[PDB]
């Protein structure tokens, strides 16, 4: 079927099978709002999944900082807040096989690739719409350690879905705003990280397409901002 | 049944989170910035969660070796000035909480409220103190919990050790996380490489 | 209309750019405008209705904007399948369409 | 499912999705009739669609002049009239691809393959059940000019359906009788031409079947004749 | 008193004494809309009125093309439409004297300063927020000929108010959208020209302030746009 938000439209039949993170639907802040001009789907450049791929990650709201009205609102206001719909699609033949976990991690504070007390640098933790494709202030490459010193088999404790290429070509995550303050700096701090990791690596025989596209579409939901400036 | 796996049971047991030691003969005081990150066994349990909120009950077990010694234990709340000297003005401030304790008396106890300007403590924080290449990253940015300060009040060759027992109370925890699979290297950091 | 095999899959981004805005130079610029991400594997046909947008109620028959198409993904196939396909584009009026002031001219000789 | 007319039976699930030409169902002539012995499906020899094919056409009633009771009625009466059901089937694998337009053209007066005022000859405009497979009184080969000096992209103005091999293997056209007189000479004049043209040429990889069959089944509908002779 | 529109505020007691051009209040287009984020007062740089001044003019919407949300909407849409509130204030002592006519002219097609059939050039007819202060494709300097070959004494046929420094320090014009089409190119065409001309020149004795400020504040009203682009 067809999903439309703002002037953006995407096609997928799986949309009713979304995982709502922690069972909480996104919402506007309670008494104790730009709507659909902000809340479009922004579709990122598709990743090439291959038998060699270690996985990918993006940080939110950072991946949207260049994206239209929402990206401008992150610079033109002091504080902000939003949920997200993340839709991940992965088109393949009946003859391809592979398993992704698609997970959203709140406060995904990255470990460095180094032994000291040295922090991960701002340039590395804010990769923008391109994300990081996994291969002295650079982050960990250990997707099997969740880039943070925790095992990949335990990653399902976070809001997640599997993409198993024989069963389903897509996953949908609905993320509420998660923070210990009502609103925060959209540029200094990321509420969520989208993590996509191949559990079972891609296999296909020669003469099949050796790269399959992973397409990520992100819509802000119930976005709110305060301290407007020109 | 299953109250022993409640968050109050799992996170709310008293443990020695710090080990203040000092000598006397400046000098005759010591300070410790309060955090749960010092001891790996305590830290691992709190880091099963992304956010936690609690009041905390401090009990200070003191041993000393050369009349009865008198100590002042002072809690300095977040953003207040910490002592630089044994008889600085900060020890007299009515905005700090002090307990005066004298040797052989029952050990001093007090509860600090949840002090933070945010509604919970960040066990993890995917952000910065600022824009710079020198800016701190992670749960060291947020979560000033205050400082515990100790001085001898008595006039004069002695060694003092204070075990800071901490019990979290009225505990709430949010957004569960995978357990730490590899050794802790440094406080507040997620770094793991030897 | 996509005319590749039943085993062929691909995403195309179909974008409409309003008059005076200027044709998109990239798939990202097209995605920031009015668009459909069309999965030709799931749906063999897609449609776009461009409504009337000019200052006068009519315009002369000698801009209205651009439709542009972009790869969202590479072309995906299993073995023993053509690694290329064809797409066919079509146009028609909606029920609101109107023509006015008839003329005859050498556009056919 | 199964479709039966007279002693003839054909199998296809698509039969409810037929295009009725001009929205008019075939009918007997109003006051201002041999039934099912005439009104069988006649199935022509299947065409070989290949990557080289330019298209095919048949003229009606001419393609049925040798076909059983209906073909005899065209010689044994002075004037006649009928509608048609045309069913076109095109069986293929999931690994073949291609697009046909199947169109019925009323009064498809062919252009010649030559520059003079010379008419197309009777032998060429009456090819019978074999039709013409497109490559001085011979007709045009320009399927892109509809063999009549008009563009192929505009052919959808006629009653038509697409066969897109990924979506549907069949098309059905229901044709009423279309003429400016109630009944006419079935042998001198053709009311309709069936035209089948590949818009997107057949593609399949080697080791797949390089020719796919196009099977045309035509049933007369509401056939009427006058001036009977032995 | 205080007048507030959007995040903009201006002070004047005269606001109820506005001239509504042709007696028609501005309105949204009838069935045969960004609101207050667009519809702010934009206050231009104040003109220096002196005894030597010949007058000033601005073109609308051209004077607002650089002004915030409304100025962006003129580039980010193909067609647009608005009315205006123009508020002109002219602060002076009891010892200054002078008379302005403040007039709004629809379709103020300028004459050139030259004798040929040569048109006024686009650079000259689109001066932006600075307007033109009156001194081969340049416009007329003859304010006494309304820059268009018509007498200044007849300028009151247009929507106008006087500023007579002894009586009133301000004028307000409310302008509906005036065009022969519902919406038009905001960049190729100006619906209105604001014209300010001293009828009686400024006089003040030495030791008084020799320049008095004319402050022009313009708010779009009922602004509408169509054909949006990013």
User: How would you describe the shape of chain A?
Assistant: globular
* DSSP E strands of chain B, number: 9
Instruction: Name the helicity range of chain A.
Output: under 10%
Give the termini separation of chain A.
40 Å
Instruction: Give helix and strand order of chain A, one letter per element, not per position.
Output: EEEEEEHEEHEEEEE
Number of strands of chain A: 13
Shape of chain B: globular
Q: Helix segment count of chain B?
A: 2
Main structural class of chain B: mainly beta
What is the percentage of strand-forming residues of chain A? 35-45%
Largest sheet of chain B: 5 strands, antiparallel
Percent in strands of chain B: 35-45%
**Biggest β-sheet strands, sense, barrel of chain A:** 6 strands, mixed
Which sequence of SSEs, written as H and E, runs from N to C of chain B?
HEEHEEEEEEE
Specify Rg of chain A, calculated over alpha carbons: 18 Å
Largest Cβ-defined interface: A-B, 42 and 41 residues
PDB class: virus
Keywords: RV-A89, rhinovirus, virus
Entry title: CryoEM structure of RV-A89
Chains A, D, E: Capsid protein VP2
What's the short story on this structure?
Chain A is mainly beta and 230 residues long. Chain A is built from 2 helices and 13 strands; from the N terminus they run ββββββαββαβββββ.
Which properties best describe this structure?
part of a larger assembly; 5 chains; A: 230 residues; mainly beta; six-stranded mixed β-sheet; five-stranded antiparallel β-sheet; 2 helices; 5% helix; B: 194 residues; four-stranded antiparallel β-sheet; 6% helix; 39% strand; globular; Capsid protein VP2 (chains A, D, E); virus; RV-A89
